[PDB]
């Protein structure tokens, strides 16, 4: 969990939750719309994905 963990998977979109505010503030330049992330799928495979939307609140 370097950046975060997946919390909802659908064939339309994937939701990823950042663990802590410190992690988000540290790597905030990398978490912009259009950047790329790597979600683990299994023990050896990875899924490359492109950030589409960001939300920071509602809690």
């Amino acid at each position: 969990m370097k950046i975060g963990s997946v919390i909802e998977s659908s064939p339309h979109s994937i939701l990823v939750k950042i663990d802590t505010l410190k992690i988000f503030e540290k790597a905030k330049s990398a978490l912009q719309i259009g950047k790329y992330l790597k979600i683990q799928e299994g023990n050896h495979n990875f899924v490359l994905c492109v950030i589409q939307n960001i939300k920071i609140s509602t809690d």
Partner: protein
């Protein structure tokens, strides 16, 4: 051989048992703990998707296993042996670790025991899915009718790491 075993290692929830023989692999006493640590850091790492505890069975005397337990305790790894000293309690070997998913806590990571008849019967009671044998141990009284037996012929822990997709080179 590595590409033959790359399936069934990509599955998160999957029981894997090992029958490693200390005599076959050189420098076993000084590298077994590190091998277990790097195996757990990759396979028994996630707390919600990795719901199976690996079991390691060694062909050695019951007295020599306390040294391994002490080494694991010193290196801060929580394991269960099932022996309170020359006595085996099957109610403790076959217990599911308690998990608390709020601070990433699990009661124990692996099961390292001997090759006695009691532990063999306990393994037979709750059979695994993939059984790995290292060193050609006499795997006869295991009721291996359901498990995917996969004999492994190695000489050092580096080859074992390479086979289990824990390394890119030898």
């Amino acid at each position: 051989r590595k590409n033959q075993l790359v399936p069934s290692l990509n599955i998160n929830s999957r029981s894997r048992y090992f029958i490693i023989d200390p005599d076959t692999i050189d420098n076993f006493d000084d590298e077994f703990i590190l091998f277990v640590k790097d195996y757990l850091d990759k396979y028994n790492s996630k707390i919600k998707l990795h719901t199976e505890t690996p079991c390691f069975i060694l062909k050695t005397d019951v007295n020599n296993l306390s040294e391994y337990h002490k080494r694991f305790v010193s290196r801060n790894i929580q394991i269960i042996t099932g022996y309170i000293g020359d006595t085996f309690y099957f109610k403790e070997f076959n217990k599911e670790p308690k998990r608390i998913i709020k601070d990433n806590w699990v009661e124990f990571k692996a099961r390292i025991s001997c090759n006695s008849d009691e532990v063999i019967k306990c393994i037979n009671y709750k059979k695994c899915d993939d059984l790995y044998i290292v060193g050609g141990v006499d795997v006869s009284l295991l009721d291996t009718a359901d498990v995917n037996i996969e004999n492994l012929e190695i000489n050092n822990f580096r080859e074992l790491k390479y086979l289990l997709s824990m390394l890119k080179e030898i």
